Amino acid sequence: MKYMITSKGDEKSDLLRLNMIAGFGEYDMEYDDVEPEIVISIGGDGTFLSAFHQYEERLDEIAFIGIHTGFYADWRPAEADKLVKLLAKYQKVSYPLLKTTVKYKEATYLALNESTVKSSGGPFVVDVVINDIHFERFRGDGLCMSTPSGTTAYNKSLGGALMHPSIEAMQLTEMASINNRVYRTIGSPLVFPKHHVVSLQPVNDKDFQISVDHLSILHRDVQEIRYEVSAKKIHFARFRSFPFWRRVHDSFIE
Amino acid sequence: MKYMITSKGDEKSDLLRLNMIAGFGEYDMEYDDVEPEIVISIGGDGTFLSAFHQYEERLDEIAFIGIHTGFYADWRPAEADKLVKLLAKYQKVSYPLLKTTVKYKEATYLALNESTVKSSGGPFVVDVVINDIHFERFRGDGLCMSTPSGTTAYNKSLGGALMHPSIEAMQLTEMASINNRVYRTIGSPLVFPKHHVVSLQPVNDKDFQISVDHLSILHRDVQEIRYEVSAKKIHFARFRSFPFWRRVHDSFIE
Amino acid sequence: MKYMITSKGDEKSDLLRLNMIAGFGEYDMEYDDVEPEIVISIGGDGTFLSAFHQYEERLDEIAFIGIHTGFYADWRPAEADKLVKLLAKYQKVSYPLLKTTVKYKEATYLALNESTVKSSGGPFVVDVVINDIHFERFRGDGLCMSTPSGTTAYNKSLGGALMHPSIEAMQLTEMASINNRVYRTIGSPLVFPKHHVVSLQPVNDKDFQISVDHLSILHRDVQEIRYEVSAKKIHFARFRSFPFWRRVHDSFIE
Amino acid sequence: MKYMITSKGDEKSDLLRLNMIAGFGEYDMEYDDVEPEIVISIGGDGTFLSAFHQYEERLDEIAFIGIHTGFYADWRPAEADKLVKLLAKYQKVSYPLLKTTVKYKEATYLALNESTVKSSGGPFVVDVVINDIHFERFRGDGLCMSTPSGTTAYNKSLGGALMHPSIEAMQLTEMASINNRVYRTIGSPLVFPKHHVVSLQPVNDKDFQISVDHLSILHRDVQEIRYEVSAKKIHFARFRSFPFWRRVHDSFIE
Ligand SMILES: Nc1ncnc2c1ncn2[C@@H]1O[C@H](COCC#Cc2nc3c(N)ncnc3n2[C@@H]2O[C@H](CNC(=O)c3ccccc3C(=O)O)[C@@H](O)[C@H]2O)[C@@H](O)[C@H]1O
Ligand SMILES: Nc1ncnc2c1ncn2[C@@H]1O[C@H](COCC#Cc2nc3c(N)ncnc3n2[C@@H]2O[C@H](CNC(=O)c3ccccc3C(=O)O)[C@@H](O)[C@H]2O)[C@@H](O)[C@H]1O
Ligand SMILES: Nc1ncnc2c1ncn2[C@@H]1O[C@H](COCC#Cc2nc3c(N)ncnc3n2[C@@H]2O[C@H](CNC(=O)c3ccccc3C(=O)O)[C@@H](O)[C@H]2O)[C@@H](O)[C@H]1O
Ligand SMILES: Nc1ncnc2c1ncn2[C@@H]1O[C@H](COCC#Cc2nc3c(N)ncnc3n2[C@@H]2O[C@H](CNC(=O)c3ccccc3C(=O)O)[C@@H](O)[C@H]2O)[C@@H](O)[C@H]1O
């Protein structure tokens, strides 16, 4: 098949990439970083994140594989040759994604971990509207909308719940909300199903720091930020069983 | 249709029940508390909880309606006559339920809010096993497994996330877990999809205080406590739009 | 000096106790468990807790030393002989204590870690009164009032802050408080200085499960539970520097 | 006495200021905003914060009074005339302050609420050193060191404990710390007594966003940030009893 390999950039990842390419040359495998059918990421979760966004316009035609030299990298470097033979002769598991829409022309972004909004300096104030219904006025440091696979990332440090990636949903968590006689927020994290639209609408300041996974851009003259579960999904190539809860156990428990 | 009405027991609920029965007598409505097709609960969430368990063996043939004199009671007392006329001439919305299985003969319970486990005196210690995989050893005050509609109840006070009832899932939260050099738990709440089985297995003490909604019984010589999303669902009769997030807003925000 | 040694009860602690007694026989040391001036605890924090309560009526005349075979046990077993020689030929550091007063005859208890109140079955409801001022009505699972040295124990798992033992204060934390349209608590932990009196007063149910360190007794017909920083302090014998924050680091960080 | 009045700037505060000045003209009161002995702040907590920093070099010779048109403003506007007569013919209560020292020439700042450190873009990473002892390596969004009176502000939203202002201490809370297999922080808030020095030392990035109450400046080429309880205190003029816990009750409970 058409494949490609991205590298973290250090010595260990660059050379593991060159050796896997050599082993692929002994099979009917064709290296192509323009229309690959397999995208292999060698490095960390940040490296895998970059590979996903590099090919986010052909997600429905690509299967991702991660090698940590990680959550999205569930393959050890010493198992590379077995991964070569396994890939040459698999099942695809799909994780949900988050669609972020920023209105001012409209701009849309796709997220594998989460998308967060913070102030451009000063207090962060937005009205939270759930399906055209005003739910709360948030005043604090920011908000974070996470995918299921992203719940073990930023969402976890903010007190969010960890949810299995088979659940097509998104989770919204708060960043240091003020709560007194005049300001009131739900405080608890919120989990939204598909087709539920969460709209963040500015009150006074219209400039916000908007992040999508590892990217963070200052957005000027913002009118609306819409969050919803994307119809697009990321596809993983799975050769062996590695349950999500076991991956959670190995990363945080023991 | 065959209907029945349960009452909180105070003067306001008992008399609202008698007046609704009188109005039902002016239509083709038959009072029957043995095989009712409509169960009307008048009181609070605890009153509705008792009505659900009173007819938990005929859930697939009953539509519940709540009147608060509440979360499950989404009808004001002054709207009773309109509810009578509306019911006489609706759509059914279904919420997921939690199945609790206690092994020692096996005992099974059905939950609308949550099921919790605490110690029978002393430290509460159980091994948490997710799909036959040992995830953690919990040592603390207890654990709480909540339905989606139950996430705004006990689950919320324990730091759990609020999730929409259209998501067929269950959420597990901790009660004062100890975490030091020797004891380690995930800390974050966990959200499980259907067909995922969470098994709590004792370590030394085998007596536990097990709750199912408002009931709490001491269980002796416990070998296993299994949690899973039930295949059974509770059915509500809906006459007007009242979104779950608006019900959340009115109960906690304003 | 007059000394005594208490043991955890296992083989390792019983024999380390007998060997230290033998080494003490080579100095001007007199074993006496009635009027000891040095109390050596060999085991864990629970063992040290029992030694403190065993001699809580002569605290101002006793210096405690802990050996973990721990927080209050800051001596390794292999350093026992050096501890014998050091003790034979020190500085005393003092930690604050918590006074608990239960009115119904009045009963008073002294705490090194904390004192907690829970319900005797059903919801736990008390009015919280701070210096004769009604601060809140607590409805939930319980409350915990911790000493400074106790903040790394139960208080920590409840979300309480860790505070240095040189601060003469007490910290109150919540256990799963309900907060909605009708019930409201502060949520945050509260730190009280000396001479501040925190009074918990029942509303309807008068039976409570009251704990003091490792002891837990059901108290019937309770009228008031008063918390205040005790004028009595526990005295430690210190031979080397071991800062509290380093003890915190070694127990939770690395 | 020599007095001065600062105003929020809106119509209600500007005119209440002019009327109080007129009433002061009927007594032996001299307006002086260079060497005032009484500083009256009319507005909100942010207005009072500006008055404190306006005269932070003569704190030991000034008594502050707050009027909310608040926590530091504990006087209603309708009680202004009584405040004029009361002031003409009081007791001083003192609150502790936080000293922040930034090394690169050395720069020192005084805080009434708190001082926070965040990254200049990217991850915030500092080593936390308590009394020349490495306690942890913090990686996350930031850290917050609060005074006692500041614990009800930013510290509260970050999960910090509320402590009485008579306790000469400072409290450190985390902002979204990452905790996994490689990163580990204490998580709990830390309360430090006087003479304890908390040093934050950079790891790689040396630019930080440092805040002191309402001011926030980007600091370049930072080598150390030292936190300690200041020897300086702010002095309030008190005419009637208004306990701190009652002020907490009125602001968050009812
Ligand atoms: N305050 C916060 N606390 C926790 N996480 C935060 C966060 N602020 C952003 N993030 C996160 O940063 C990610 C970008 O990096 C790649 C990744 C990944 C990543 N995905 C996951 C995942 N699905 N599940 C579990 N771990 C993950 N990781 C692990 O995240 C760590 C990487 N991050 C940081 O160390 C980091 C921490 C704090 C601040 C900045 C960074 C930073 O580097 O930017 C690595 O160990 C990865 O293996 C963003 O997507 C935010 O989720
Ligand atoms: N520590 C805890 N903190 C918060 N909740 C706790 C909890 N311990 C159990 N629960 C809960 O008690 C429920 C039994 O009661 C009927 C109900 C209901 C109920 N359902 C819901 C719901 N789906 N969503 C939102 N609110 C709900 N409510 C509201 O819950 C309040 C009732 N409870 C208590 O006041 C209460 C609080 C503390 C302790 C005991 C009780 C008690 O009464 O037993 C009422 O306002 C209801 O309207 C159990 O199912 C546990 O969920
Ligand atoms: N839900 C809770 N979560 C955390 N702690 C809780 C707690 N419920 C009570 N406690 C606590 O139990 C203590 C009685 O035990 C001796 C001690 C001690 C003890 N002091 C301290 C301390 N100053 N600083 C740091 N660690 C300490 N320890 C360490 O506490 C662990 C002992 N406890 C348990 O394992 C335990 C955990 C959960 C439930 C029950 C027990 C139990 O055994 O009763 C051991 O590792 C000790 O070294 C009570 O004083 C409550 O503070
Ligand atoms: N994420 C956070 N969550 C909570 N607080 C935060 C915070 N980030 C900074 N702060 C805080 O902002 C303060 C500057 O403002 C004057 C004051 C004061 C102030 N002192 C206190 C106090 N001792 N006790 C109780 N309330 C206080 N207040 C009340 O704080 C509210 C003012 N603040 C904001 O609304 C605000 C909220 C979020 C974000 C920005 C702002 C902002 O305006 O900058 C007003 O109601 C005041 O009455 C800084 O000192 C940070 O403590």
User: How is A89-147 classified by DSSP, letter by letter?
Assistant: --EEEEEEEEEEEEE---EEEEESSEEEEEESSS-EEEEEEETTEEEEEEEESEEEEE-
Q: CA-to-CA distance for B170 and B163, rounded, in angstroms?
A: 10
β-pair type (D2-7, D30-31): parallel
CA distance C121 to chain B (A): 9
Indicate the top mutation candidate among D154, D215, D252 to test ligand 4's pocket, ranked by most ligand atoms within 8 A of CB: D154
Contact B176 C175 (CB under 8 A): yes
Which residues of chain A does D250 touch, with a Cβ-Cβ cutoff of 8 Å? 181
Which atom of ligand 2 lies at the shortest distance from residue B251's CA? 25
Which atom of ligand 2 lies at the shortest distance from residue C180's CA? 46
Contact A188 B243 (CB under 8 A): no
Contact B252 C141 (CB under 8 A): no
Tokens representing D103?
């090394």
- Assess contact for C221 and C206: CB atoms under 8 A: yes
Distance of CA D98 to the CA centre of its chain: 8
Experimental method: X-ray
Which residues of chain D does C185 touch, with a Cβ-Cβ cutoff of 8 Å? 253
Indicate the top mutation candidate among A119, A124, A178 to test ligand 4's pocket, ranked by most ligand atoms within 8 A of CB: A178
Tokens representing C75?
């001596």
Partners of A193 in the β-ladder: A169
Touching D: A residues 87-116, CB under 8 Å: none
Contact A177 D157 (CB under 8 A): yes
Provide the residue type at B157 as one letter: S
Contact D154 A176 (CB under 8 A): yes
| Catalytically active residues of A, by annotation | 45
Helix B11-24 crosses helix B80-88 at what angle (to 10 degrees)? 30
Q: CA-to-CA distance for B34 and B38, rounded, in angstroms?
A: 11
To 5 degrees, how large is the angle CA B82–CA B86–CA B91?
A: 135
Q: Torsion angle, CA of D118/D123/D124/D127, rounded to 10 degrees?
A: 180
> Which residues have CB under 6 Å of ligand 4?
A 123, 139-141, 176, 178, 180; D 44-46, 49, 70-71, 113-114, 149-150, 152-154, 157, 213-214
Q: Tell me the DSSP string of chain D.
A: -EEEEEE-SSHHHHHHHHHHHHHHTTTT-EE-SSS-SEEEEEE-HHHHHHHHHHTTTSGGG-EEEEEE---S----GGGHHHHHHHHH--EEEEEEEEEEEEE---EEEEESSEEEEEESSS-EEEEEEETTEEEEEEEESEEEEE-TGGGGTHHHHTTPPEE-TTS-EEEEEEES---SSS-----S-EEEETT--EEEEESS---EEEEETTEEEEE-S--EEEEEEEEEEEEEEESS---HHHHHIIIII-
H or E segment to which residue B125 belongs: strand B124-130
Which atom of ligand 4 lies at the shortest distance from residue D150's CA? 23
Interface check B246 vs A, CB under 8 A? yes
Q: CA-to-CA distance for A166 and A49, rounded, in angstroms?
A: 19
| Mutate: best of D114, D120, D141, partner A, most A CBs <10 A | D141
Q: CA-to-CA distance for B54 and A33, rounded, in angstroms?
A: 63
Q: CA-to-CA distance for D122 and D104, rounded, in angstroms?
A: 20
Q: CA-to-CA distance for D106 and C140, rounded, in angstroms?
A: 50
For the sheet with B215-219, list strands across it: A162-163, B190-193, B169-175, B142-146, B114-119, B208-212, B215-219
Contact B185 A253 (CB under 8 A): yes
CA distance A187 to chain D (A): 10
Does C149 show up as a binding residue in the annotation?
yes
| Mutate: best of B117, B119, B124, B157, partner C, most C CBs <10 A | B157
Phi, psi angles (nearest 5°) of residue D34:
-105, -50
Distance of CA D145 to the CA centre of its chain: 10
- Sketch out chain A's domains with CATH numbers: 1-96+232-254 (3.40.50.10330), 97-231 (2.60.200.30)
Active site residue B213: no
Q: CA-to-CA distance for C243 and D95, rounded, in angstroms?
A: 27
Indicate the top mutation candidate among D45, D49, D215 to test ligand 4's pocket, ranked by most ligand atoms within 8 A of CB: D45
| Mutate: best of A151, A174, A186, partner B, most B CBs <10 A | A186
Which residues of chain C does D193 touch, with a Cβ-Cβ cutoff of 8 Å? 164, 166-167
**Which chains are adjacent to chain C, needing at least 3 Cβ pairs under 8 Å?**
B, D
Q: CA-to-CA distance for A102 and A121, rounded, in angstroms?
A: 19
Give alpha helix (H) positions in chain C.
11-24, 45-54, 80-88, 154-157, 244-248
Distance of CA A74 to the CA centre of its chain: 16
Contact D161 C166 (CB under 8 A): no
Give the ligand with the smallest distance to the CA of D125. 1
B114 lines ligand 2 (CB under 6 A): yes
Provide the residue type at D34 as one letter: V
Which residue is closest in CA terms to ligand 2's atom 42? C123
Closest CA to D4 of D50, D56, D51, D61: D51
Which residues of chain C does D249 touch, with a Cβ-Cβ cutoff of 8 Å? 133-136
Which atom of ligand 1 lies at the shortest distance from residue D182's CA? 46
Interface check B131 vs A, CB under 8 A? yes
Tokens representing C244?
């509290």
Which of C28, C32, C33, C45 is catalytic? The answer is: C45
Q: Which of D192, D246, D252 sits opposite C164 (nearest CB)?
A: D192
Interface check B186 vs A, CB under 8 A? yes
Q: Torsion angle, CA of B40/B42/B45/B48, rounded to 10 degrees?
A: -30
CA atoms within 13 A on the CB side of A154: 25
- Assess contact for B46 and B73: CB atoms under 8 A: no
Contact A164 B188 (CB under 8 A): no
Q: CA-to-CA distance for C133 and D245, rounded, in angstroms?
A: 8
Does C131 show up as a binding residue in the annotation?
no
Say what the resolution is, in angstroms.
2.3
Q: Which residue of A has its CA nearest to B197?
A: A245
